Design a protein around this nucleic acid. Structure first.
Lengths: 223, 215, 237, 339, 299, 222
RNA sequence: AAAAUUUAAAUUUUUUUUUUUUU
């Protein structure tokens, strides 16, 4: 599990986190709740605006959808009624690819969720549950399934997959699925098998994470 | 280039090719867009030339600007698929559009209220082996039907008729003119340019009122 | 080894208890259930408190959430008539303060403060969803003119949990060693604002640099020498 | 105190404008949809292909038109028209690097003037993505085999075409989606309307000159020099054309799904967790939060699947139910218009 | 989006300069300490000066050159601000003024100055060249961005290498990365910019007709320092003692004799920091080659 | 004169019957859907009542009590329209609460009723920010205790209010009131959508059944 | 020798991507 993270590493920003998995370095930033614009408010719930900068090039359409699916996942994570007529701008930076951006977007989508989850903990906003995302691929030639592949394995991968889950009761109960990003060729039969490791693995991920949060923040906490 | 769209790799290019009194006709339809409150559909086909276009209504929309006594019209001409008329070529027509309806619409019935008009020059055949001037009068007809569909207070079924690069718009069964447009043509052909426009106007308005009163 | 928690954990306490809610916990308006919705450590209020206990999560933040009966430090930013425009934190929402909420309450008498001043005030009335309001003079002052406009001084920003320890805690070692060098003033703002005025700007910079460093290091036991060194750094001269 | 609190009720058209959500909950009480449908009642789909391409008339292809294979789509209350053009760049098993796509541009005429809306900017990306993930298109299908126009006797031209095999060339295709009367989510109809346009695309016969006049030119440096390569401008034929080669066994179709959970309060007599597909009707699109969207090619194949779970849980069985409902709705449309 | 500071706090710093103090702990004419660290990629670096953090990235790819200079390759620098680095900023405003004040500098600092040989991007004339890219990211602001982005770009150019090329007309042979080595780039001169920060303790007239020069100038305004300054000035130089650019675009009025006296002190500052880059480029590549020695003996 | 296209010329300004030997004059009075248009034909002028819309002719009269005859001309649709029923002064309009100020309250216009219930909802999409919005000022909530006004104790965002038009105001918004015992809050969900449905306890108060929770809203008389 | 005489300053949001200028 060659993952590792940092909390509270920016200065003027409410929530900040560096998430580092095996090859990709991504930092996310959270500022909120702050003053919303005119065209942006909601009378009841909390308004969210999300920016992802790539490592390379500028913000285009390829960025836009990875943003927007990430809009969908955070919306139930946030206790959105708690902050009416408000705004939390959240911003993600891709620093390292770790995957061919021309051909793939898979790991980053797993990465940025795992990034933005922790900067909210830095931010300390009313949230709902716990979460995790992993990238999963199925090899074209071997026809086997690897959790957390590499980009060369992505080249021989047949189908690329991202699973986002909602974890409660010690992060143990799968409360709901958040995202299942099925891409590539697949059938019925692989899919329930495709969950069935990530059923375990994301909890196994969070099992690491629960420790990490308290280790970083209980010395920031006072006794 | 444009960082907001997918325009392909730059060094590509589109594909290239080289050489190796008549009747106009309509098919007019309303009530088919659920975003709008006024829709109108127009087919046209005449002798080498087949044309289809869509007129869209949004109103009365609120005005964030300030107070007005009455209503305000906004008109958009947009290229469809094949034919590409020039940008500045478009808005000149949009200017010519608004003048006529400002002798049509009871804006005084609609204080502080907006009028949105979207015209989609969707598809045109010109198979013939002032190219925008041949499509002027059909716009006014296409707008009028959609504006009847939103049910807005209109004085007259006003229409324009065409005679060979010349566009003249009428009311009162042709007994007054509300909109004048002229390109090159002859000199002092105006009196015949009264006539052939008028009778198409005499044709068209009857085709329009059939499209609604029979529905 | 604490009552550490996550949003989405099992809430510890039985449901049949009369319990005053502290912050950090949220009750469902839809399904009436109650859950911890923030990060950190619970601290259960111990028994005997009229048979009514209270839960609250220690959570960490810098972005201050306006809440009532809370002493904050503010900035005059506009003269919306009858009722001031005042801010508490940059990029946040402005707050409204009456022109009359003042210890000589007099409606024919319009007070004197101008755009850009620092004032000491307590949050009087603030819904979660409404334009919040503060007061310098309060009824809960009990006719006390203890808040007020400030003079020049110097104000430093910290995180909120630190500022609680500045207010709520005598074990907080900071005010000891500072009094052990010079004599001065201190205003405490729950908006992460700390306003200090000394007799000297020289010691104020000495007051400045410690509080930047100490709150950064956040290690209250170490603050003995760290504070005193900056004096020598001023007494470098 | 037990009180007969009389509520205030309205016409239903009043209610949906007010509550998208409770008016939905009225329909769920009877178990219907506010688009007047029952749970699994699905919209009709109607097309015409190839009407707006110049290759409509096989007998007389006209002169100034530039459209390859066209598609009309109406389903429900939203008409969407798909148009295909193509371009050419001078070109110099089942793995992704064999696989290309097109360049689409969507517009939704949703009344708002202004720049490119953010809903649109997702769309042309999202299609292109799973088109790559469909693996439909080997670039062998883009390989262009040009002829040379032999300047023959007494001033006549015949293009020598080679057959069955120095530079190479490649088609690069384009799309445009116009969206009229948006009433709900659009992506499935964005998908499916393209698919019928894809099958109607002819590849026009491209050729180069016999020996183009546009030849090599030199550029002087500050003492040195180089040579511009000869500019062989490819020309497509006014007449001849070939069709398009497709991995036809991967042509998917689209379907969305929604799962909701129910209030006891909202009933009117004439847990409980209901699957709805064929989603429309703003009140639905507001209030459904756990959703499923699927691509599938009719032999049990799947180009993609899309889960956003934000409302209910998801059973393993609503999955299989939607899968059962996937292979129906797609396969009918494969067989509906037989193109 | 507006930063609010009390006028009481405004006088405070203005007093501290009047008793020769500044809040950071530096001297007036003292610069922060710079932490340079590279990522594993070539043209990958993280640069950090206390609070201000930046990151940039160099890349290159194949394109044709312009008609304009058909000899030479293509190169441009992106400096798109994200509001990540501070809540002042719009989402990617390329039309804000301070952005342009960040832009045109680095435009002149690199592109019009030409530290980099664009003619050494010519693979084949008019047919295929390089398109070299410089995306600047800001992380967190304490000012000095335009000095930081001055450095971090020029840091990145001295760490990027481009891969191997072979030409046969159209048969242009980009080789595999790991058989045939990537090749670094040609830097004509190394520019370093310097922010200067200006403070009238007086009114306008004592600057205008008060003949007594009384104006304090410091290096590397911190965030609170930067919000009250009266003029804005940046100079840029090299190791060969030539002046790259100067930009005082208005603000406070300012004596000429100060500016030369200012710019001389720039020289001794920038030279030491420059060589610190030069060793670390070597020393990391030494660490690359010592780990290359720790690789081939390992493998 | 039965069914009308816009532009259908209908009748002159005046008409004549003879009801039993004494002469009675008609006065055709222009209403909605009408316009008097002068017409010269072969020399002589002529004013006429003109159909300006789509649907049916309807001629009516009523004299104000509190041989000529006035006849109101009235033009309708006949076998979905709201520009027909744009809000005028004094009307009863159902609105949804947008934002709560200490100054005032802001809503958007959604539905207009009618006289001798009969309605006209707007068919617009508020998610464009399209619709007409209005403003209730806080002292205009009611007249009883109109000074010391506590705005939060009557309204929350997103809620439904039977309110009366004061006047036009600006072009941007409206002058609006609720200042009656029959007017005010119609319906909302608990905790602004975060909970169930709430019922007006009195005319003056509101609770919720399943919860056991009440809130202060300036409810309408039911 | 008393008596008394004068003021009053203004509040809550509408817009279209970056080339490219003579060794």
């Amino acid at each position: 599990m060659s993952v590792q993270a940092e909390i509270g590493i920016l200065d003027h920003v409410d929530g900040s986190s560096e998430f580092v998995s095996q090859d990709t370095k991504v930092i996310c930033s959270v500022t909120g709740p702050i003053e919303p614009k005119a065209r942006q408010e909601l009378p009841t719930q909390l308004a969210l605006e999300i920016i992802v900068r790539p490592a390379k090039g500028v913000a285009t359409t390829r960025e836009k959808v990875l943003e927007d699916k990430l809009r969908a996942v955070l919306t139930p994570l946030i206790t959105r009624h708690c902050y009416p007529r408000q705004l939390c701008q959240i911003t993600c930076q891709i620093l390292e690819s770790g995957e061919d951006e021309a051909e793939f977007s898979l790991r980053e989508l797993s990465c940025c969720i795992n990034a933005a989850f922790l900067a909210l903990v830095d931010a300390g906003i009313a949230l709902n549950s716990m979460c995790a995302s992993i990238p999963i691929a199925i090899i074209k030639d071997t026809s086997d399934i690897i959790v957390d592949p590499t980009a060369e394995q992505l080249k021989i991968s047949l189908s690329v997959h991202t699973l986002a889950l909602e974890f409660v009761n010690g992060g143990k109960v799968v409360k709901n699925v958040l995202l299942l990003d099925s891409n590539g060729d697949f059938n019925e039969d692989q899919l329930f098998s495709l969950l069935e490791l990530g059923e375990q693995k994301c909890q196994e991920l969070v099992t690491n994470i629960r420790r990490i949060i308290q280790d970083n923040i209980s010395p920031r906490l006072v006794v | 280039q444009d960082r907001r769209r997918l325009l392909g790799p730059a060094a590509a290019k589109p594909m290239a090719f080289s050489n190796t009194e008549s009747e106009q006709e309509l098919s007019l339809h309303t009530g088919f867009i659920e975003n709008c409150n006024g829709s109108a559909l127009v087919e046209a086909r005449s002798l080498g030339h087949q044309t289809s276009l869509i007129s869209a209504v949004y109103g009365p929309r609120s005005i964030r600007g300030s107070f007005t006594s009455q209503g305000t019209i906004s008109i958009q001409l947009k290229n469809g698929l094949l034919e590409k008329y020039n940008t500045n070529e478009l808005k000149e027509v949009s200017s010519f559009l608004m003048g006529i309806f400002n002798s049509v619409v009871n804006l005084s019935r609609y204080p502080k209220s907006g009028i949105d008009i979207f015209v989609y020059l969707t598809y045109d055949k010109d198979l013939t082996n002032s190219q925008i001037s041949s499509l002027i009068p059909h716009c006014i007809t296409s707008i009028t039907l959609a504006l009847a569909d939103a049910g807005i207070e209109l004085v007259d079924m006003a229409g324009a008729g065409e005679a060979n690069g010349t566009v003249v718009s009428f009311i009162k069964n042709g007994e007054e003119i509300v909109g004048f447009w002229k390109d090159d043509g002859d000199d002092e052909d105006l009196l015949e340019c009264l006539d052939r426009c008028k009778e198409q106007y005499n044709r068209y308005r009857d085709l329009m009122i059939s499209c609604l009163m029979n529905q | 080894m604490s009552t550490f928690i996550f949003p989405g954990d099992s809430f510890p306490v039985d449901p049949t208890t009369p319990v005053k809610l502290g912050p950090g916990i949220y009750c469902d308006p839809n399904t009436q259930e109650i859950r911890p919705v923030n990060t950190g450590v619970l601290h259960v209020s111990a028994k005997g408190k009229s048979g009514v206990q209270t839960a609250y999560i220690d959570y960490s933040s810098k972005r201050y959430i306006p809440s009532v009966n809370d002493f904050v430090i503010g900035v005059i930013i506009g003269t919306f008539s009858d009722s001031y425009k005042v801010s508490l934190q940059n990029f946040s929402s402005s707050v409204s303060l009456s022109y009359m909420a003042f210890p000589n309450a007099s409606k024919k008498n319009r007070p004197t403060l101008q755009v850009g001043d620092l004032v000491y005030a307590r949050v009087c009335t603030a819904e979660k969803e409404l334009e919040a309001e503060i007061e310098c003079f309060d009824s809960t002052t009990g006719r006390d003119a203890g808040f007020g406009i400030l003079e020049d001084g110097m104000i430093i920003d910290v995180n909120l949990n630190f500022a609680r320890q500045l207010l709520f805690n005598n074990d907080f070692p900071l005010l000891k060693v500072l009094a052990a060098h010079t004599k001065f003033e201190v205003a405490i703002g729950l908006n992460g604002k700390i306003w200090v005025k000394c007799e000297e700007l020289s010691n104020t910079l000495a007051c400045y640099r410690t509080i930047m460093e100490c709150c950064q290091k956040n290690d209250t036991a170490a603050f003995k020498d760290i504070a005193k060194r900056q004096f020598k750094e001023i007494l470098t001269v | 105190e037990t009180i007969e609190i009389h509520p205030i009720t309205f016409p239903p058209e009043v209610l949906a404008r007010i509550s998208p959500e409770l008016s939905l909950q009225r329909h769920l009480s009877l178990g219907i949809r506010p688009c007047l449908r029952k749970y699994e009642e699905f919209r009709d789909v109607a097309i015409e292909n190839n009407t707006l391409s110049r290759y409509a008339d096989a007998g007389n292809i006209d002169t100034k038109n530039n459209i390859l294979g066209s598609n009309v789509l109406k389903s429900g209350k939203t008409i969407v028209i798909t148009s295909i053009t193509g371009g050419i760049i001078e070109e110099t098993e089942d793995i992704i690097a064999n696989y290309a796509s097109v360049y689409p541009v969507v517009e939704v005429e949703r009344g708002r003037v202004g720049a490119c809306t953010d809903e649109e900017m997702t769309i042309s990306q999202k299609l292109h993505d799973s088109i790559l993930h469909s693996r439909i298109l080997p670039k062998k299908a883009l390989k262009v085999k040009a002829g040379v126009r032999s300047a023959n006797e007494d001033g006549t031209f015949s293009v020598l075409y080679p057959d069955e095999l120095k530079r190479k060339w490649s088609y690069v295709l384009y799309a445009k989606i116009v969206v009229l009367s948006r009433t709900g989510p659009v992506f499935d109809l964005c998908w499916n309307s393209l698919m019928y346009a894809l099958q109607s695309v002819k590849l026009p016969r491209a050729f180069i000159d016999e020996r183009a006049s546009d030849l090599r030119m030199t550029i002087r440096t500050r003492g040195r020099s180089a040579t511009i390569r000869e500019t062989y401008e490819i020309i497509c034929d006014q007449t001849k054309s070939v069709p398009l080669m497709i991995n036809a066994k991967n042509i998917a179709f689209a379907s969305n799904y929604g799962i909701v959970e129910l209030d006891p309060e909202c009933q009117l007599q004439n847990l409980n967790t209901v699957l709805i597909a064929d989603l429309d009707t703003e009140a639905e699109e507001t209030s459904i939060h756990s959703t499923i969207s699927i691509l599938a090619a009719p032999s049990g194949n799947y180009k993609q699947l899309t889960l956003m779970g934000g409302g209910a849980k998801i059973t393993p069985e609503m999955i299989k139910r939607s899968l059962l409902l996937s292979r129906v709705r797609a396969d009918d449309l494969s067989t509906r218009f037989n193109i | 989006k507006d930063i609010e500071i009390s006028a009481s706090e405004s006088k405070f710093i203005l007093e501290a300069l009047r008793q020769n103090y500044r809040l950071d702990g530096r001297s007036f004419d003292q610069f922060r300490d710079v932490e340079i660290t590279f990522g594993k990629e070539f043209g990958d670096v993280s640069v950090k000066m206390g609070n201000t953090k930046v990151h940039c990235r160099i890349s290159c790819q194949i394109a044709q050159p312009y008609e304009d200079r058909p000899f030479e390759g293509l190169f441009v620098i992106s400096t798109e601000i994200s509001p990540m680095a501070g809540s002042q900023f719009e989402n990617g405003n390329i039309t804000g003024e301070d952005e342009v004040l960040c832009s045109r500098i680095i435009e002149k600092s690199v592109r019009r100055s030409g530290a980099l040989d664009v003619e050494g991007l010519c693979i084949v004339a008019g047919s295929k060249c390089w398109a070299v890219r410089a995306d600047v990211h800001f992380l967190d602001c304490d000012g000095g961005f335009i000095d930081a982005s001055c450095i971090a770009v020029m840091a990145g150019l001295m760490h990027f290498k481009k891969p191997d090329i072979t030409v046969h007309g159209e048969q242009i042979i980009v080789h595999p990365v790991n058989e045939r080595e990537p090749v670094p780039l040609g830097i004509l001169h190394i520019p370093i910019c310097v922010t200067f920060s200006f403070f009238n303790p007086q009114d306008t007239e004592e600057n205008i007709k008060g003949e007594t020069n009384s104006e304090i100038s410091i290096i590397d305004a911190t965030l609170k320092e930067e919000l009250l300054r009266d003029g804005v000035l940046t100079v840029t130089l090299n190791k060969n003692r030539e002046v790259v650019q100067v930009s005082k675009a208005g603000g406070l009025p300012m004596d000429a004799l100060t500016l030369m006296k200012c710019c001389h002190e720039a020289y001794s500052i920038i030279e030491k920091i420059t060589d610190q880059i030069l060793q670390l480029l070597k020393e990391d590549s030494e660490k690359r080659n010592k780990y290359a020695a720790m690789l081939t003996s390992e493998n | 004169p039965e069914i009308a296209y816009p532009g259908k010329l209908i009748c002159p300004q005046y008409g004549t019957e003879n009801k039993d030997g004494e002469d009675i004059i008609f006065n055709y009075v222009p209403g909605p859907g009408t316009k008097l248009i002068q017409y010269e034909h072969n020399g002589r002028t002529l004013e006429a009542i003109t159909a300006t819309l789509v649907g049916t002719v309807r001629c009516e009269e009523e004299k104000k009590t509190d041989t000529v005859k006035n006849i109101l001309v009235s033009v309708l649709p006949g076998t979905n329209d709201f520009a027909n029923n744009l809000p005028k002064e004094g009307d009863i309009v159902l609105t949804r609460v947008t934002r709560l100020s200490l100054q005032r309250a802001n809503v958007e216009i959604l539905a207009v009723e009618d006289k001798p219930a009969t309605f006209s909802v707007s068919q617009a999409s508020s998610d464009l920010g399209e619709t007409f919005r209005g403003i209730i000022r806080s002292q205009d909530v009611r007249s009883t205790d109109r000074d010391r006004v506590k705005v939060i104790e009557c309204f929350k965002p997103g809620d439904i209010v039977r309110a009366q038009v004061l006047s036009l105001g600006d072009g941007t918004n409206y002058y609006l009131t609720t200042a009656r015992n029959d007017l005010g809050v119609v319906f909302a969900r608990a905790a602004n959508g975060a909970g169930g449905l709430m019922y007006a306890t009195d005319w003056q108060m509101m609770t919720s059944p399943v919860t056991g929770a009440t809130e202060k809203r300036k409810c309408a008389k039911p």
